Amino acid sequence: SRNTSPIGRNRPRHDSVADLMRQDMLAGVRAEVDPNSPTGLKNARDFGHRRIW
Amino acid sequence: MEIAFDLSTIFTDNIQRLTRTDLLKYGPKRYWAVAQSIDCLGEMSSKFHGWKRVITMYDKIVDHDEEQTTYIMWEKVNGSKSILKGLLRVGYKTLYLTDNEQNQYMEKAMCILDFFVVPTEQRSGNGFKMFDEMLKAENVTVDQCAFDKPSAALQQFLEKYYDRKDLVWQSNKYALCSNFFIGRHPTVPF
Amino acid sequence: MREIVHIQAGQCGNQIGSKFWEVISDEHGIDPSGQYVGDSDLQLERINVYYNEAGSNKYVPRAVLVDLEPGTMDSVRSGPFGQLFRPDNYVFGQSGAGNNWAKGHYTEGAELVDNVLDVVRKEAESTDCLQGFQLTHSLGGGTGSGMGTLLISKIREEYPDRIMNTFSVVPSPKVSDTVVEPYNATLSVHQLVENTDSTFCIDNEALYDICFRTLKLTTPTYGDLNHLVSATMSGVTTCLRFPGQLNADLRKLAVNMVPFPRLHFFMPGFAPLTSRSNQQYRAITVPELTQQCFDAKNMMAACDPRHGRYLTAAAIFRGRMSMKEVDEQMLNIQNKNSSYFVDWIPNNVKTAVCDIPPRGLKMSATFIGNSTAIQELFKRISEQFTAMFRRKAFLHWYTGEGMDEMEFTEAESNMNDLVSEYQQYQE
Amino acid sequence: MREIVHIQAGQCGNQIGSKFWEVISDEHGIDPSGQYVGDSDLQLERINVYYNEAGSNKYVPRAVLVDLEPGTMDSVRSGPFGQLFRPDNYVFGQSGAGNNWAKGHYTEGAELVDNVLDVVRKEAESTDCLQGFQLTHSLGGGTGSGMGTLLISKIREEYPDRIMNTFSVVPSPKVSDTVVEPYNATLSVHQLVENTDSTFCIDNEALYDICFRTLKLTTPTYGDLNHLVSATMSGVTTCLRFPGQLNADLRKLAVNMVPFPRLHFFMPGFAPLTSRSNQQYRAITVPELTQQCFDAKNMMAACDPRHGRYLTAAAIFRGRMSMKEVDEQMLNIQNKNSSYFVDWIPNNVKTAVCDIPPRGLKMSATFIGNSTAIQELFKRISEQFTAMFRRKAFLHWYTGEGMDEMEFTEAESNMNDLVSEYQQYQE
Amino acid sequence: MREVISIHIGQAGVQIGNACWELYCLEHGIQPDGQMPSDKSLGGSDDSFSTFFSETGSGRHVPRAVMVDLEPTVIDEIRTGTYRSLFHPEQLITGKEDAANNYARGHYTIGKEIIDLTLDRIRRLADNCTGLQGFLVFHSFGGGTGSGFTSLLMERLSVDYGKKAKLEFSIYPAPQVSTAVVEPYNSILTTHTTLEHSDCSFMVDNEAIYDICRRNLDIERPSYTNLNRLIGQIVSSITASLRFDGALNVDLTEFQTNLVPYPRIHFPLATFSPVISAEKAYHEQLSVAEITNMCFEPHNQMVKCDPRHGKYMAVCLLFRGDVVPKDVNAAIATIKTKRSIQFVDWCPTGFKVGINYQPPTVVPGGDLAKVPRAVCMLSNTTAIAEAWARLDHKFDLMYAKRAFVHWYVGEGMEEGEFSEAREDLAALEKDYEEVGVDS
Amino acid sequence: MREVISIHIGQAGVQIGNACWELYCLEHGIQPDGQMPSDDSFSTFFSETGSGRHVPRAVMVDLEPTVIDEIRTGTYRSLFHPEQLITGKEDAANNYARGHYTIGKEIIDLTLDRIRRLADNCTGLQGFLVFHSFGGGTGSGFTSLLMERLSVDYGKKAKLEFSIYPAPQVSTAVVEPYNSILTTHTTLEHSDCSFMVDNEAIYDICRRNLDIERPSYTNLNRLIGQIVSSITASLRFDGALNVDLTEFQTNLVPYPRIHFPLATFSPVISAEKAYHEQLSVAEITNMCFEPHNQMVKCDPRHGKYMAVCLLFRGDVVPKDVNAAIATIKTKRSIQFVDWCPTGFKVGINYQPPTVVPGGDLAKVPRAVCMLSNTTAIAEAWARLDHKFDLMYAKRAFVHWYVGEGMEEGEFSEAREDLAALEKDYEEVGVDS
Numbered sequence A: 001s002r003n004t005s006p007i008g009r010n011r012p013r014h015d016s017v018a019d020l021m022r023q024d025m026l027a028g029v030r031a032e033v034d035p036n037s038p039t040g041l042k043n044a045r046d047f048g049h050r051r052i053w
Numbered sequence B: 001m002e003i004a005f006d007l008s009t010i011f012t013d014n015i016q017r018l019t020r021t022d023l024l025k026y027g028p029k030r031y032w033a034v035a036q037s038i039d040c041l042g043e044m045s046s047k048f049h050g051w052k053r054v055i056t057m058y059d060k061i062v063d064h065d066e067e068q069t070t071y072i073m074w075e076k077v078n079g080s081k082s083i084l085k086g087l088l089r090v091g092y093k094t095l096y097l098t099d100n101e102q103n104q105y106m107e108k109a110m111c112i113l114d115f116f117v118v119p120t121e122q123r124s125g126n127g128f129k130m131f132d133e134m135l136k137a138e139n140v141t142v143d144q145c146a147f148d149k150p151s152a153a154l155q156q157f158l159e160k161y162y163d164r165k166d167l168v169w170q171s172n173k174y175a176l177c178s179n180f181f182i183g184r185h186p187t188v189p190f
Numbered sequence C, D: 001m002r003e004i005v006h007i008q009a010g011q012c013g014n015q016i017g018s019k020f021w022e023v024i025s026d027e028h029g030i031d032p033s034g035q036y037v038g039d040s041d042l043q044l045e046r047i048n049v050y051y052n053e054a055g056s057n058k059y060v061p062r063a064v065l066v067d068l069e070p071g072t073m074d075s076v077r078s079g080p081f082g083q084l085f086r087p088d089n090y091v092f093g094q095s096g097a098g099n100n101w102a103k104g105h106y107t108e109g110a111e112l113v114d115n116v117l118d119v120v121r122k123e124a125e126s127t128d129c130l131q132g133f134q135l136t137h138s139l140g141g142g143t144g145s146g147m148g149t150l151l152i153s154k155i156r157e158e159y160p161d162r163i164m165n166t167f168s169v170v171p172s173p174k175v176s177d178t179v180v181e182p183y184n185a186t187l188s189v190h191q192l193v194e195n196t197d198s199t200f201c202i203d204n205e206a207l208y209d210i211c212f213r214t215l216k217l218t219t220p221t222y223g224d225l226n227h228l229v230s231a232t233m234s235g236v237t238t239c240l241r242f243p244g245q246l247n248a249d250l251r252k253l254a255v256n257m258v259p260f261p262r263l264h265f266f267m268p269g270f271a272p273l274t275s276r277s278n279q280q281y282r283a284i285t286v287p288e289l290t291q292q293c294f295d296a297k298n299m300m301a302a303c304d305p306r307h308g309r310y311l312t313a314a315a316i317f318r319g320r321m322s323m324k325e326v327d328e329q330m331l332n333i334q335n336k337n338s339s340y341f342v343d344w345i346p347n348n349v350k351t352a353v354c355d356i357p358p359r360g361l362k363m364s365a366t367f368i369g370n371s372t373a374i375q376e377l378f379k380r381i382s383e384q385f386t387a388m389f390r391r392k393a394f395l396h397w398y399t400g401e402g403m404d405e406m407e408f409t410e411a412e413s414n415m416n417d418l419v420s421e422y423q424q425y426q427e
Numbered sequence E: 001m002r003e004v005i006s007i008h009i010g011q012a013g014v015q016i017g018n019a020c021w022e023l024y025c026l027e028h029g030i031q032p033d034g035q036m037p038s039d040k041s042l043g044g045s046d047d048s049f050s051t052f053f054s055e056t057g058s059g060r061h062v063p064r065a066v067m068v069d070l071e072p073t074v075i076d077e078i079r080t081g082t083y084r085s086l087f088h089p090e091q092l093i094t095g096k097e098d099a100a101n102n103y104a105r106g107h108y109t110i111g112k113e114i115i116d117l118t119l120d121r122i123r124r125l126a127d128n129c130t131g132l133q134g135f136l137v138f139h140s141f142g143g144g145t146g147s148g149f150t151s152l153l154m155e156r157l158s159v160d161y162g163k164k165a166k167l168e169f170s171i172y173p174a175p176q177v178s179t180a181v182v183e184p185y186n187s188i189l190t191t192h193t194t195l196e197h198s199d200c201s202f203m204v205d206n207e208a209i210y211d212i213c214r215r216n217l218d219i220e221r222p223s224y225t226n227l228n229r230l231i232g233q234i235v236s237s238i239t240a241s242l243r244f245d246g247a248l249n250v251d252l253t254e255f256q257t258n259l260v261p262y263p264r265i266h267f268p269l270a271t272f273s274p275v276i277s278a279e280k281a282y283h284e285q286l287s288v289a290e291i292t293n294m295c296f297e298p299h300n301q302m303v304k305c306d307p308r309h310g311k312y313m314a315v316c317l318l319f320r321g322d323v324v325p326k327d328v329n330a331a332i333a334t335i336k337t338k339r340s341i342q343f344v345d346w347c348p349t350g351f352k353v354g355i356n357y358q359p360p361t362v363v364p365g366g367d368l369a370k371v372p373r374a375v376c377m378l379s380n381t382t383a384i385a386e387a388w389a390r391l392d393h394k395f396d397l398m399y400a401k402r403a404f405v406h407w408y409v410g411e412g413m414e415e416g417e418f419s420e421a422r423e424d425l426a427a428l429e430k431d432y433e434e435v436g437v438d439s
Numbered sequence F: 001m002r003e004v005i006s007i008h009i010g011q012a013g014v015q016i017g018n019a020c021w022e023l024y025c026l027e028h029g030i031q032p033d034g035q036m037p038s039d040d041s042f043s044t045f046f047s048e049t050g051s052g053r054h055v056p057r058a059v060m061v062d063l064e065p066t067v068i069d070e071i072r073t074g075t076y077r078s079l080f081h082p083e084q085l086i087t088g089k090e091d092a093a094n095n096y097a098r099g100h101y102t103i104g105k106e107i108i109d110l111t112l113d114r115i116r117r118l119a120d121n122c123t124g125l126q127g128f129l130v131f132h133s134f135g136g137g138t139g140s141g142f143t144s145l146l147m148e149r150l151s152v153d154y155g156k157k158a159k160l161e162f163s164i165y166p167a168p169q170v171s172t173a174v175v176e177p178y179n180s181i182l183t184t185h186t187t188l189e190h191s192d193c194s195f196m197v198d199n200e201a202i203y204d205i206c207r208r209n210l211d212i213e214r215p216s217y218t219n220l221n222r223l224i225g226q227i228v229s230s231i232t233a234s235l236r237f238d239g240a241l242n243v244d245l246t247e248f249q250t251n252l253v254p255y256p257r258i259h260f261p262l263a264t265f266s267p268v269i270s271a272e273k274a275y276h277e278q279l280s281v282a283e284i285t286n287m288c289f290e291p292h293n294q295m296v297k298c299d300p301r302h303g304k305y306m307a308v309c310l311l312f313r314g315d316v317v318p319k320d321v322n323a324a325i326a327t328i329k330t331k332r333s334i335q336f337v338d339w340c341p342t343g344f345k346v347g348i349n350y351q352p353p354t355v356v357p358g359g360d361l362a363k364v365p366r367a368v369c370m371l372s373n374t375t376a377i378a379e380a381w382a383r384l385d386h387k388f389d390l391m392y393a394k395r396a397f398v399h400w401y402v403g404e405g406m407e408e409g410e411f412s413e414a415r416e417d418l419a420a421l422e423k424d425y426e427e428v429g430v431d432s
């Protein structure tokens, strides 16, 4: 079979320090949560207001 | 991002269809470029979507209990440098599906495990191209596919390019269209 | 030169503080990611009051987020402007105090207060000259009220000469959501009297009434109430951050508003509060602005000022205007309602005029009042505490953490002494 | 001009050198294929320090890879940088030393030493003016700890005046990963004290502690540890490749470090190591860099520097900064930690500022500390060796390859002297 | 982060646990196979599954439940049924012979045979979790196993864990419906242990739920499945605040602090007001005021006692889905102004309102309709003393002739224990009567 | 470049080799016919025919031809080279002398010739793998003779023997104490590492774990194949801190005669229970040291450990291994000698175990094979010594050996040699 063949790896070869050292990466962005999700509803209601003025 | 390798000499065309056997053959020992691309794209997707852990890894794909098919976009820039422009992972899972009127289902349906596009060219005709190529390769229409927790971008993409509405919120945290004639009903409401 | 440290305790404190930092960042043109995206150099100047520096025009608030439940930290981080704060400032326990003042004040509060004080003093020593501390919490809850009182005591022990302002959300019978909240409120009033320099008592009933009658808010969630409280919080400190004809910092407000050391329980308000329908049907000039400032329905303490003589008042204006008009309106509002103000004090209103109005308003005027109507606001809680303590209801929960009925009796006596002191100058 | 020859011995040393070449190629803009893809003229002005020009824009590193087990060379060839090195520079044997110092130092590596020296000489005579040798190995292993010492002795015999830098990973009790590592460690440190001029003592336990605490990494792989060591190595020789305000090469560093010939063991570190979350909210300045270089937790040796007085120290800063700030930081650190520095040397800490920072990094500071705290590590290794030598735990495996029993006594004899010499100046 | 451990004892406990775990599997998107089909549900706020379902290294999810029964029939039904792969094989603890509706048999004789294994499995689960909030114990209050083994396990857990919360959901015997002729004996024998070893004994009657299904769901002839599903709905709504985001969260500790006035007065009444058929769903407005009013009506209580004859001490409302706190405040005001709903004079405010942003989920094929709003009204009322009065009357009538006593005394029980349990129940009802008296 | 010669002697050794080579073929993807459809790991165990067919590097010898003919008629008849399956005419009849002096010598020449033929074709010989049973006649005597000649010819090469120690009470022969005693003397001189196992211990493992109450000799063997594959996997699969046979011997063998390690495979659980159990590195490391998980029927708690090798496989992080080892060392029950402060050796490999179809073991992500050189095996040798004393007091069945050309005094010599070995462990186990 094919799965019987030797399996390589990448987790040992991951170098997370290189990402940490690169201070030039300052994206600071995150995807919007689902508005209908409970966390989305909380963000809209408790942490959100409608413009009054 | 970008990867310093000749992705032209390892992949036949711009769109590459990689399965579990394909990724096993493209081992990191002698073909590290593809595995590094998979890991980098998975990490970028996890960071962008804000997930607590990465969901797409080469190691987590090769050892999975079921076969999965992944898609990646590569473009050679200047000799030994190439860039990554997207990632798509689709697999076949037995879903405990349900529909309106509390219908029951058991039919196997296609799953879009992950769908990430680079923010530089997110809407630049890349996601549509990848999805169309995946549909052509699998010869499977959208009417028999399931989406795993579609972020607002996914459903707006479906609205804009396929006019598919009334997405059902499955109890399995999956989303499907209104077409449920794939199989019979193990349990009718009454 | 007058940096201010912000402390958030409890769920209500955390949410109101998040809204406050959202509004402050809106005023200063601070990106939710911490960058600066403003257009006026006035915002960039004097930004050290609320924001430290992190290099490459990135600023992080001088805010400490405290709560015994990590879920509040997760919600704050996931919410808007969550990335603004610093993770080292996030200090939390294992489980919430469970509406128990003793749990959040003697065991879990005591365990967490060491880390909280370490973070607070680390932030304070980074300031050139701190103006003081401002804290946001809720008296009804256990974590908020208990650990807030503990923090107030510890801070007053550590920084005796600095200004401590707390924006307490006092409980009310009409919008009561906790069974044992009278106990927590009674326990916390004593500490608030003893250690805080000036407290801005806030009630959810008053804010809901404002949202219903002043504005036309339909289904007003907690976000709208927090936004109103945030607007007041930003207004009462606009002189420390912006120029103005007649500046007035927090110490000046305390001096003008506090005749006696214990009579420092204020009554906040926001003037330019008009419904979305009555927007073009009313101007926002100084006269109606002050009239809304002194209107009884525009109070955030849910006690009618008509039932108690005003001791002192302070309307902190913002935006371009004329000092003559402001002085005329203050004199008119003092003369036309002389029965509502103490006769033994000649001038009862302190005037402060800033230069930068809130983003989106031509002018604004945050009103604070040391009225004696707080008698009713505290007397309702005293009555509830008396009724509950008559039969020692729910008291085993408090005594399980190392409490005694003597503490409850002392707190009730202190609250009664406070209300009697207010009644002394009532009439 | 001031060329450096790099030799990688053992699995640990070979992997560390591979990661070091990755880091150097990233800094100098060298493509993994060997081509130059950089965009700054300073990346090419001093490319001769570590590389050799291949004519067609290809730059082959001046590295000699040695290991008795061909698996490491096979992995390097199959790695991302298989074509970077010269294919004839991989000098490998047939079978590994079997974690046996006797084998690699007396028979199995003894056959290979001739070829290794031949390739080292071929690399050396191609240089315009050789500066020194960089040799990476592990004290706990067999082939690394044996071949490295034999090759060091041969090089010192051949090249008496050229400086010798060894970046040796030292075994730790908490990461005890070999039954017979104390024997190899002592048998190697004897030759190190005898021959080399500068040894950087890296410890796996300290690197794990740094990755878990400072960087907050849940799963520290060997790539991360090798990247830390590579960053340290790049920082050490940053004055040989990039011009700066105050330049300090290898020989100047050696002169400023050692007060006596046998006290040439150092504990390095890295300044800008920050967590993923705190990266954006931390202001990187000369102070923060200095108090992180001199932080006890940031040291890459298991021994606590606070347990012994510093002999000499030096931080090789990188990036644009004011030398007044650097001098003030050094003076402040000297004043605060007066108990941790020797009295008989007036100015202990050395400084060096380099203009070009690491790629993607605004500024950095590589710390090198010559302290008596290494006596703790040496005492631990000596105690383990004594425990395993009272009863001759594994002595026969070493006597089978031609050693005498007396050699192990002599090897431990110098450890007592080496510990005493370090302890002699400690107070 | 916050985890709870569910213990289901006896046939009734195990069946209610089946209902509860079906509902939780639907709530968290977990298949009966134990695998979560969603990989992206492992990040973000979707980590709510860690409260009830533990995660293994194979990608499956193992519920934090212990199914224990002296007889193996129902557990074998589980092992053969749809949830074969869900529960951990060593968590499905079985004996060899049932308790035969004998409290002594389930307490000492057959209890001691497997009490050690049960405690070992519970300790093994507790060690794995790091944020154990408390224990949710499900048992029948009038059976043999679910009384004796429940008492033994409760006392052992109280000794070995102490301050950890212990929430009990017991099927209290109905006033008229009785499937066991000797159930009052077991009920009073276990009411002594559950009084000093639990924290919130949410008692339930079978006849009350039968009436609820008859009048609301139009189910003329229901069975145990509907009752178990309703109880599971109540438990899930109670625990929703531990795993879902929403304003005014209610943890277990604050729940007990606000609802339990005195150490012994911890016997509330649990109800699920928005119960309605799918046919009547369209016509109903399902407003917050309507739901809150449906909470307090005597026909929606799940213990067959008249709440009018007693005074409410503390009421906890745990809303779900689209709920605005202004609506809740208005509903509380309307409830307070009603003269029929009598509150004690020593409790001015007794409404611990909890709100959640997770709408209730409906199991396929269930009787309950899909609703956007739901709430559980849990009130500590003095009107529950009537149930104990009925139980005391039944016990006195049965014990005057000393009937069935030999069965109990043949397994180590002594009549002194019967007298002690009866005296304890009399003292408890006296405490309720005396506290209900206004000051 | 790193390949090992494996030799199977006796019925037990041959049957173990069946499972071992099935497991190797599964791991390397070689079809049982010897053809691999679809990358150099097989060089350790298999040789290239130049036509795509891969042949194992094994020599199979047995005096009785029944089992070898069974293999030659079996499914795996196409793997081994047809004329290296060396068979005799009659067995040794559970007699050491029969398999050493009379019948074994007639076939020892051919066996050594085939071993030499494999060695000459070899280029990177690492060591010898010998599978045999102490209790049997041929598997004792012929193994003794063969490994003696192998030590003479290739004294510079490692010799690893996987013997089947007789169980304390479970036995299938009446004269197995004699054979085991006679083999004990000859294993000391030539064998470099003897990983004996007990049938009773594997029976208990298959009973408690795997929930199998009728385990045959087809289940015991699969486990031994897993053990040997885990030992050898560091030679054919890349990983962090691979352990060669020379490294294994250096780390595990403190003294020239103290070279009798145990063997253990921890992640052995049933498929129905594997899914619901979290098999962390700490858990498997902890259950390696359980008394009932060792594949020798002895209590390691009574003895003191001297050298431990942990050969992890699959998804393993070195930090997790270090934490687990620290946790183990903090436990006072697992006692180590005072003169070996660092008695742990770790081998981490990236290749997870390959599960045999229809086998008793489930698919797991990580696995560890712990080989400990402890003094607990002195109890097993003491009980065997007592059995030999009981049988030799009356000279029960020595007349067969005398009539087969063996002196009676050889029994006393072997007895005193085993007594000296037990005294050696008693001496060494004493702390400094």
Ligand SMILES: Nc1nc2c(ncn2[C@@H]2O[C@H](COP(=O)(O)CP(=O)(O)OP(=O)(O)O)[C@@H](O)[C@H]2O)c(=O)[nH]1
Pocket: A046, C009, C010, C011, C012, C013, C015, C016, C067, C068, C069, C096, C097, C098, C099, C100, C138, C139, C140, C141, C142, C143, C144, C145, C169, C175, C176, C177, C178, C204, C222, C223, C225, C226, E248
């Ligand atoms: N105006 C607001 N009132 C709020 C808000 N959140 C809660 N509250 C009210 O505050 C009161 C106390 O509730 P809290 O959640 O603060 C209890 P606290 O967090 O202090 O303690 P723990 O729950 O033990 O952590 C109660 O009446 C709530 O209805 C909010 O965002 N705005």
Ligand SMILES: Nc1nc2c(ncn2[C@@H]2O[C@H](COP(=O)(O)OP(=O)(O)OP(=O)(O)O)[C@@H](O)[C@H]2O)c(=O)[nH]1
Pocket: F009, F010, F011, F012, F013, F015, F016, F064, F091, F092, F093, F094, F095, F099, F133, F134, F135, F136, F137, F138, F139, F140, F164, F166, F171, F172, F173, F199, F217, F218, F220, F221
């Ligand atoms: N573990 C295990 N032990 C086995 C197996 N086959 C036989 N044995 C054991 O072998 C021992 C006896 O040795 P055998 O191999 O039967 O005999 P022999 O060594 O071939 O010697 P002869 O009788 O001369 O053939 C007994 O303890 C058996 O239990 C097997 O497949 N696995």
